[PDB]
Amino acid sequence: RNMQEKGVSEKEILEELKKYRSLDLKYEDGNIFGSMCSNVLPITRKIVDIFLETNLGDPGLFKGTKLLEEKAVALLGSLLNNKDAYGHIVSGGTEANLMALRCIKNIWREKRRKGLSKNEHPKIIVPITAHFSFEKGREMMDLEYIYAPIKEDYTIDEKFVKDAVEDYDVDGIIGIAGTTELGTIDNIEELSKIAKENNIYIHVDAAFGGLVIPFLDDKYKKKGVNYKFDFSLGVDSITIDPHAMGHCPIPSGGILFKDIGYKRYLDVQATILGTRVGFGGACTYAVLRYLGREGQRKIVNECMENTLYLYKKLKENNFKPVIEPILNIVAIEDEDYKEVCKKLRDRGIYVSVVKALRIVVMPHIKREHIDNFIEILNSIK
């Protein structure tokens, strides 16, 4: 516990660390059911080693690692239908969302300096399903949120947004492509039309869904759900995280803006962090190149196959999924959800907690794990 005068040997400290690591869960062990992280693609371990001693906070010293960040951003942009995107491979979806909020706020500041806004703080429409990073941004940056309600399918009420934009002077709209709790997809196409018609910035949070939705086989797509979310809709920015469904090591988050014109509104380097990893960009570029669309499609639809297997097994055992799954996320309605979560923990099953248990069917979740999960859950009931 205290700092010591004398050092210890490598063998002593590594065996201590391994003892602590043995207290952790591991993704591959059939314990973790409620996380949007998973095992990294094995090749990334080598890449992390190669790029460990780089720093994208000083890109003039690491020109190649900086180029690889630009290439990673370009590949994500291509996936999102935008060959001119301006962006960064940042620390995660939180920093990405915070940077989009900073941009929204600085567009507002410029208006305020010209007398073109009656808002004393940026006014941003945010669905109540938004990830907590949006609350961190509100709290830090003194934003005013207009919380948008959700419809029966748990997607943002587009008519509310349109009415609010008519009633109020609005500085930004947030839409979510893959909500944290349920994996639902807001109607970005309609939100983007509202935004374009009213000259309002729109940010899409695709932290999770951005690397799932473009790869979904048709049999997993649902009638009447719109899967369009990217720059083909003319949106201003998109968060999309390789360390979620991109199989990249933390920290690998992504923020893309429609073009380089947005960079000036990130002025105070454009990232929140200063000193920052170079291996995230290298891993993001390398994994997307190594897999190609074919390899990512295979992984995404394997997860969707296991998601629909879990959904089927749940109904067969008389459990009530909140919704038919859209992405590789299923939630189980339960009034005793807190106690059931604890009882599951006691038996080696870690879900997250909507009066529901959330299951994220990442690539580490296999059929045998779902079978084991159902068996344990029945026993609890």
Ligand X SMILES: Cc1ncc(COP(=O)(O)O)c(C=O)c1O
Nearer to a copy of itself, 45 or 381 (CB): 45
CB 175 within 8 A of CB 191: yes
Interface with ligand X: number of residues (CB under 6 A) = 17
Does 100 bind ligand [N+] (CB under 6 A)? Our answer is no
Burial track 8-22 (b if 16+ CB lie within 10 A, e otherwise): eeeeeeeeeeeeeee
180 contacts which partner out of a copy of itself, ligand [N+], ligand X, none, CB within 5 to 8 A by kind? ligand X
**Which residues inside 132-191 make contact with a copy of itself, applying CB under 8 A?**
132-133, 135-136, 139-142
Does 36 bind ligand X (CB under 6 A)? Our answer is yes
348 contacts which partner out of ligand X, a copy of itself, ligand [N+], none, CB within 5 to 8 A by kind? none
Q: Which two tokens stand for residue 275?
A: 């000193």
CB atoms within 10 A of CB 95: 22
Does 353 bind a copy of itself (CB under 8 A)? Our answer is no
7 contacts which partner out of ligand X, a copy of itself, ligand [N+], none, CB within 5 to 8 A by kind? a copy of itself
Q: Which of 94, 237, 296, 306 binds ligand X (CB under 6 A)?
A: 94
User: Residue type at 77?
Assistant: G
Distance (Å, whole) CA 33 – CA 123: 36
Spell out the residues 6+ positions from residue 336 whose beta carbon is closer than 8 angstroms to its own. Answer: none
Measured CA to CA in angstroms, residue 248 lies from 102, 211, 286, 292 at distances of 26, 12, 9, 14
Nearer to ligand X, 145 or 208 (CB): 208
Pairing of strands 201-205, 237-239: parallel
Does 351 bind ligand [N+] (CB under 6 A)? Our answer is no
x/- letters, 321..350, toward ligand X (CB under 6 A)? ------------------------------
249 contacts which partner out of a copy of itself, ligand [N+], ligand X, none, CB within 5 to 8 A by kind? a copy of itself
Measured CA to CA in angstroms, residue 157 lies from 78, 162, 178, 223 at distances of 29, 9, 16, 18
Distance (Å, whole) CA 277 – CA 209: 24
Distance (Å, whole) CA 129 – CA 132: 9
Q: Which of 31, 55, 269, 372 binds ligand [N+] (CB under 6 A)?
A: 55
- The residue number whose beta carbon is nearest to ligand X equals 93
Nearer to a copy of itself, 271 or 307 (CB): 271
C-beta of 72: minimal distance to a copy of itself in Å?
11
Which neighbouring-strand residues pair with 172?
124, 201
CB 378 within 8 A of CB 321: no
x/- letters, 59..78, toward a copy of itself (CB under 8 A)? -xxxxxx-xx--x--xx--x
Interface with a copy of itself: number of residues (CB under 8 A) = 97
Distance (Å, whole) CA 101 – CA 98: 5
x/- letters, 14..53, toward ligand [N+] (CB under 6 A)? ---------------------xxx----------------
Distance (Å, whole) CA 299 – CA 295: 6
Q: Site residues (CB under 6 A) for ligand X?
A: 36, 57, 92-94, 97, 131, 133, 176, 180, 205, 207-208, 241, 253, 274-275
Q: Site residues (CB under 6 A) for ligand [N+]?
A: 35-37, 55, 58
